[PDB]
Amino acid sequence: TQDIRLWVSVEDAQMHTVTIWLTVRPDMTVASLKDMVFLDYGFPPVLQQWVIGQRLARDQETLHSHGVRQNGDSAYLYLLSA
Amino acid sequence: DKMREEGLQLVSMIREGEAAGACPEEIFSALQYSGTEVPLQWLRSELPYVLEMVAELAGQQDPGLGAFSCQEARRAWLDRHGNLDEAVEECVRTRRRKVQELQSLGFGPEEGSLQALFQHGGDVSRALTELQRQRLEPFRQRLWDS
């Protein structure tokens, strides 16, 4: 499975929403998704909570298992703090 | 360790007449990463003008596209087998296409499209990340705030 542009809404405890695009693979795990966000954006995996295909996403689950499949599919990232 | 082996190859790109497109920045960085340092201006004056020419020419041909990077110049240059009027034309073509990709991903020139592209060697993913990272910074900061 090849590269997919993913439309992500990012929120935290308080703020405003912001939306970003990420490159993923449907066979990527959430753990790998989180590691990538850490590496690029500096958000510890531990403070990352994801909802994908209307369900909370766990570390060992693939994006595929949450129905990710095509460019413009969406996902939701919520950030805890300190 | 894998970065050393890249530094070696990057540095080899200036032996006595090594047909190639050395980019002064890359070599300069390879040395910083290594632990020394060499004046950046001195590298510029050691290498041919070729790749900067390609870049200046592309900038002349469409100033609407901002500054061209050495990596984008080299790319077009290699693709056209050292043919210099052909490198310019493809260098512009490749950059135009990219500006509207960023546009259609929500970043036109008025939003820093052009500088991020230059700054990241015409690499869209990396421009995009950089650009998205500037705007996500408040969120990053809040992780450590309260």
Curated annotation (Swiss-Prot), chain A:
Region (Interaction with RNF31) location: 18-80
Post-translational modification: Auto-ubiquitinated. Auto-ubiquitination leads to degradation by the proteasome. Phosphorylated. In vitro, phosphorylation inhibits auto-ubiquitination activity.
Domain spans labelled Ubiquitin-like: 4-68
Induction: By viral transfection.
Family: Belongs to the RBR family.
Clinical note on disease: Polyglucosan body myopathy 1 with or without immunodeficiency: A disease characterized by polyglucosan storage myopathy associated with early-onset progressive muscle weakness and progressive dilated cardiomyopathy, which may necessitate cardiac transplant in severe cases. Some patients present with severe immunodeficiency, invasive bacterial infections and chronic autoinflammation.
Subunit: Component of the LUBAC complex (linear ubiquitin chain assembly complex) which consists of SHARPIN, RBCK1 and RNF31. LUBAC has a MW of approximately 600 kDa suggesting a heteromultimeric assembly of its subunits. Interacts with beta-I-type (PRKCB1) and zeta-type protein kinase C (PRKCZ). Interacts with UBE2L3. Interacts with PRKCH. Associates with the TNF-R1 signaling complex (TNF-RSC) in a stimulation-dependent manner. Interacts with EYA1, TAB2, TAB3, MAP3K7 TRAF6 and RIPK1. Interacts with IRF3.
Function recorded in the entry: E3 ubiquitin-protein ligase, which accepts ubiquitin from specific E2 ubiquitin-conjugating enzymes, such as UBE2L3/UBCM4, and then transfers it to substrates. Functions as an E3 ligase for oxidized IREB2 and both heme and oxygen are necessary for IREB2 ubiquitination. Promotes ubiquitination of TAB2 and IRF3 and their degradation by the proteasome. Component of the LUBAC complex which conjugates linear ('Met-1'-linked) polyubiquitin chains to substrates and plays a key role in NF-kappa-B activation and regulation of inflammation.
Comment, domains: The RanBP2-type zinc finger, also called Npl4 zinc finger (NZF), mediates binding to 'Met-1'-linked polyubiquitins. The UBL domain mediates association with RNF31 via interaction with its UBA domain.
Listed name of the protein: RanBP-type and C3HC4-type zinc finger-containing protein 1
Species name: Homo sapiens
Full protein stretch here: 52 to 133 of 510
From Swiss-Prot, chain B:
Protein name: E3 ubiquitin-protein ligase RNF31
Recorded family membership: Belongs to the RBR family.
Residues of the full protein shown: 482 to 627 of 1072
Gene: RNF31
Positions of the UniProt region annotated as Interaction with RBCK1: 82-135
SS bond partners: none
Quaternary assembly: Component of the LUBAC complex (linear ubiquitin chain assembly complex) which consists of SHARPIN, RBCK1 and RNF31. LUBAC has a MW of approximately 600 kDa suggesting a heteromultimeric assembly of its subunits. Associates with the TNF-R1 signaling complex (TNF-RSC) in a stimulation-dependent manner. Interacts (via the PUB domain) with OTULIN (via the PIM motif); the interaction is direct. Interacts (via the PUB domain) with VCP (via the PIM motif). Interacts (via the PUB domain) with SPATA2 (via the PIM motif); interaction is direct and bridges RNF31 and CYLD. (Microbial infection) Interacts with S.flexneri E3 ubiquitin-protein ligases IpaH1.4 and IpaH2.5, leading to its ubiquitination.
Taxonomic superkingdom: Eukaryota
Domain UBA: 83-134
Tissues expressed in: Expressed in both normal and transformed breast epithelial cell lines.
UniProt domain comment: The PUB domain mediates interaction with the PIM motifs of VCP and RNF31, with a strong preference for RNF31. The RanBP2-type zinc fingers mediate the specific interaction with ubiquitin.
Subcellular localization(s) per the UniProt record: Cytoplasm
Function: E3 ubiquitin-protein ligase component of the LUBAC complex which conjugates linear ('Met-1'-linked) polyubiquitin chains to substrates and plays a key role in NF-kappa-B activation and regulation of inflammation. LUBAC conjugates linear polyubiquitin to IKBKG and RIPK1 and is involved in activation of the canonical NF-kappa-B and the JNK signaling pathways. Linear ubiquitination mediated by the LUBAC complex interferes with TNF-induced cell death and thereby prevents inflammation.
Posttranslational mods: Autoubiquitinated. Interaction with OTULIN is required to suppress formation of 'Met-1'-linked polyubiquitin chains and prevent subsequent inactivation of the LUBAC complex.
Associated pathology: Immunodeficiency 115 with autoinflammation: An autosomal recessive immunologic disorder manifesting in early infancy and characterized by combined immunodeficiency, recurrent bacterial, viral, and fungal infections, as well as autoinflammatory features, including arthritis and dermatitis.
